[PDB]
Amino acid sequence: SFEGQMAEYPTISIDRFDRENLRARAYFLSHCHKDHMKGLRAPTLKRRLECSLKVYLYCSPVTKELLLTSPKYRFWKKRIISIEIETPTQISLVDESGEKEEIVVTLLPAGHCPGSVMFLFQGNNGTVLYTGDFRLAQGEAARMELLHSGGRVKDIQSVYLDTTFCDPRFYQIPSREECLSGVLELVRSWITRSPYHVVWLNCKAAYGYEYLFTNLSEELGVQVHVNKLDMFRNMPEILHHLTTDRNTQIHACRHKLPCGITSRNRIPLHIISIKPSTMWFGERSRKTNVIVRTGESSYRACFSFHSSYSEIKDFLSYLCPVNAYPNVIPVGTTMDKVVEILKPLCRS
Ligand code: NI
Ligand SMILES: [Zn+2]
Ligand SMILES: [Zn+2]
């Protein structure tokens, strides 16, 4: 499993900050999800930063902004360097001994959550790609010019990639746009009935639902109720679509409505729940409705943080690396199953 270190560049640590990663010459954070931040504010890391002054954390501008809105990560402020998207950037890896290694890093959009990137590393031990978590539609990788060298893909030694749905059963997942349209039309059909018709979006406590909130808000002229929006203080395109006020027809608040509003003018609110949920169809199956009704007032809506099996295979086929290493072992699969699934798309 992925524990922060790529074989080709062991002195850099990505999305893991404990154990062997405490000796990193440089840190990288692909996105602000708890599963990719293990040890990032551990006392032993703070201890290590105080004895190693030339050690920085690199991330996207949006990841820097989101991380530093948390008081518990503010200690990073002096040591965090943002890298502009698709802007190859020279980084020095200094042995705190005499050793000095130069690497070039390029951030590519991952389509996973605000600030989410893949890291392409170029150095004297080959080119490697760390995808972090990603959802890339067919053809998106082909359009990324900085993955190419003279009209073919770069020679990539190793890809460390998001294998969350790397199982043939998860063959196809409806597109970002198909999922959005389904939720938008369901919400529109409900809240246009009267001012007392309201929707609860039952979402996980994680970044990545903002594009759903912004679209619903833009299209229906309504602000989405959330527990907290201060992390978007300097992100106006997200911020103005959100509200902490309960008096709205679209709620994404978290533990009827979590925020406790049950009526307006003593008229009972007419509430439906919509739970963004991963849905998929098999290789030999047809796409069905992104909206699944689970009760008189309850719905599941297709939504994915991660690429389908067909999207993983298309991406890795295209990259054609020597090696592909799964970042994730799916619950009902084995690492041997995942490694062997991808082996035919690799040069070794
Ligand atoms: Ni994630
Ligand atoms: Zn993750
Ligand atoms: Zn609410």
Numbering used by the authors: 3 to 98, 100 to 258, 269 to 361
What does the paper say about this structure?
Artemis (SNM1C/DCLRE1C) is an endonuclease that plays a key role in development of B- and T-lymphocytes and in dsDNA break repair by non-homologous end-joining (NHEJ). Artemis belongs to a superfamily of nucleases containing metallo-β-lactamase (MBL) and β-CASP (CPSF-Artemis-SNM1-Pso2) domains. The overall fold of the catalytic core of Artemis is similar to that of SNM1A and SNM1B (2 Å backbone RMSD); it has all the key structural characteristics of human MBL fold nucleases, with the di-metal containing active site at the interface between the MBL and β-CASP domains.
The catalytic domain of Artemis (aa 3–361) fused to the basic His6-Zb tag, which confers tight binding to cation exchange columns, was produced in baculovirus-infected Sf9 cells. The protein was purified using immobilized metal affinity chromatography (IMAC) on a nickel-Sepharose column as the initial step. We compared the catalytic domain purified using IMAC (which contained Ni2+ in the active site) with catalytic domain protein purified using ion exchange chromatography (avoiding IMAC), which contained predominantly Zn2+. As observed in structures of SNM1A and SNM1B, Artemis can coordinate one or two metal ions in its active site. Notably, a second metal ion binding site, unique to Artemis, with similarity to the canonical Cys2 His2 zinc-finger motif, is present in its β-CASP domain. Similar to the canonical Cys2 His2 zinc finger motif, the zinc ion coordination in Artemis’ β-CASP domain adopts a tetrahedral geometry, with coordination by two cysteine (Cys256, Cys272) and two histidine (His228, His254) residues. Thus, using radio-labelled gel-based nuclease assays, we showed that the truncated Artemis catalytic domain (aa 1–361) with either copurifying Zn or Ni ions (as observed crystallographically in the same preparations) have similar activity with the full-length Artemis construct (aa 1–693).
